[PDB]
């Protein structure tokens, strides 16, 4: 497959070119917030982002080489991690705030509008702060986002009878290629050999926190749907079902 024959520079270029757009919220800024209305804005936005994500996924080198079944599994597993890493990236330049959309920039006190949400806001903001502390670069961001896509559900490919871990060599080869790409990016930026492995680990450990936030966010979203606070799109309902 071509994805394996891409140079590191080619990988980066492909990922950068695949990036989804930053969408706007429907927020009417002359109107107030309620718990219901804020959850409505956030889930309306997420629904629209999901469509763009699915089409981004197809442009991640190696993803189309997978079966449709595997493609579904990976996205079902990682969708909220992917939305969340994007959010944290967008919010880097806005300390103490989350840039859900250019017309929906919320501080943690606005998170208190929704019961249980400020806890999620705080974790997202802490990650945004880590991104700043690390001076995370766009080329690194796109690598990490593709890693989430390919990695998050790779350990839950279980055989139909026996439920033994299926070997997914191709996915791991592509993951190895993205590792190669990250190292190349860091070397290009003048990081020493030692700094390269140190930063590689710092970046990958972020993904543990992102998983944590995804899990907590999923439970919170599920609570909102189970209390009839907001109606979720059929797509979002199905992405939630895949997990509560």
């Amino acid at each position: 497959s071509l994805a394996l024959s891409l140079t590191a520079d080619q990988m980066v270029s492909a990922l950068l070119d695949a990036e989804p757009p930053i969408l706007y919220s429907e927020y009417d800024p002359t109107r107030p917030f309620s718990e219901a209305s804020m959850m409505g804005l956030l889930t309306n936005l997420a629904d629209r982002e999901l469509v763009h994500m699915i089409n981004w996924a197809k442009r991640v080198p190696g993803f189309v080489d997978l079966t449709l079944h595997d493609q579904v599994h990976l996205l079902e597993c990682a969708w909220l991690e992917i939305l969340m890493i994007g959010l944290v990236w967008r919010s880097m330049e806005h300390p103490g705030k989350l840039l859900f959309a250019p017309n929906l920039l919320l501080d943690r006190n606005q998170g208190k509008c929704v019961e249980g949400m400020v806890e999620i806001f705080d974790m997202l903001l802490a990650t945004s702060s880590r991104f700043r502390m690390m001076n995370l670069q766009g080329e690194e961001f796109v690598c990490l986002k593709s890693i989430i896509l390919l990695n998050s559900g790779v350990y839950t490919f279980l055989s139909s009878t026996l439920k033994s871990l299926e070997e997914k060599d191709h996915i791991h080869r592509v993951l190895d290629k993205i590792t190669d790409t990250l190292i190349h990016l860091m070397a290009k930026a003048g990081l020493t050999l030692q700094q390269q492995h140190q930063r590689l680990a710092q970046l990958l450990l972020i993904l543990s926190h992102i998983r944590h936030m995804s899990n907590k966010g999923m439970e919170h979203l599920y609570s909102m749907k189970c209390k009839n606070v907001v109606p979720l799109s059929d797509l979002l309902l199905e992405m939630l079902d895949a997990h509560l």
Partner: peptide, 9 residues
């Protein structure tokens, strides 16, 4: 399944 369809379409 919406995801399945969107991935194919």
């Amino acid at each position: 399944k919406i995801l399945h369809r969107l991935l194919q379409d």
